[PDB]
Amino acid sequence: SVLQVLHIPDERLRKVAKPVEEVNAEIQRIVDDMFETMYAEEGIGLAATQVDIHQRIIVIDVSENRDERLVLINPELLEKSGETGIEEGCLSIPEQRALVPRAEKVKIRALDRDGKPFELEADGLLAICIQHEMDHLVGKLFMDYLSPLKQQRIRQKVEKLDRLKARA
Ligand SMILES: [Zn+2]
């Protein structure tokens, strides 16, 4: 199933996710809906909390044709280094993009779909995308990194979009 993605100014976007107690089949269904929803929305990453599920699950797939899906359940950041950024977008902040400072390299520990632990050293777009999605899990949005004015702007704009989203 495709899940409804929350947009700003929804307050549920600011909730902190609880860790997954057990990676069982209810979790694995959350994973497939999350993947489906992400592909339907044309994202490369998506966190549980954007779909109103407040648990530490992220899916990502940067690959051309879905042969490289990535699942991180209860991720933890082990190390980071460097700094970069690109003009990010967010499914919950429709049609807005902004350069955001990120660490350039990142080392994480997470569980996969099967509840197995793995470690991942990422750089490039992958590193940026993981940092973005991990922020979602503690209630952070990329616009939180920008000035009051920039945010104030990003907020007017999206409300206008969705104004017309319910289109009627
Ligand atoms: Zn996002």
Ligand 1: distance of its center to the CA of 141 in Å?
A: 7
Cα(93) to centroid of ligand 1, in Å?
7
Other Cβ atoms closer than 10 A to 139: 16
Sign of CA dihedral 73, 28, 48, 89: positive
CA–CA separation, 13 vs 51, rounded Å? 9
> Which residue, among 6, 8, 4, 2, has the nearest Cα to 96 in the 3D structure?
8
Q: Which two tokens stand for residue 35?
A: 């993947």
Catalytically active residues, by annotation: 133
CA of 26 to the centre of ligand 1 (A): 23
Ligand 1 centre distance from Cα of residue 162 (Å): 17
Buried b (16+ CB within 10 A) or exposed e, 10-38: eeebeeebeebeebeeebeebbebbbebb
Distance 142 CA to ligand 1 centre (A): 7
136 assigned ligand-binding residue? yes
Residue 129 is labelled as binding a ligand: no
Please report, for residues 49, 155, 159, 160, 162, the alpha-carbon distance to residue 166 in angstroms, rounded to integers and kept in the order given.
22, 17, 11, 11, 6
76 has which bridge partners? 109
Cα gap 5→43, rounded to integer Å: 11
Separation CA 42–CA 47 (nearest Å):
14
C-alpha distances in angstroms, 85 versus 49, 64, 76, 117, 152?
A: 23, 22, 21, 28, 21
Structure's resolution in angstroms? 2.2
Known binding residue 7? Answer is: no
Closest CA to 128 of 148, 99, 154, 152: 99
Residue 65 CA to residue 137 CA, distance in Å, equals 26
Method for this entry: X-ray
CATH fold group of domain 1-168? Peptide Deformylase (3.90.45)
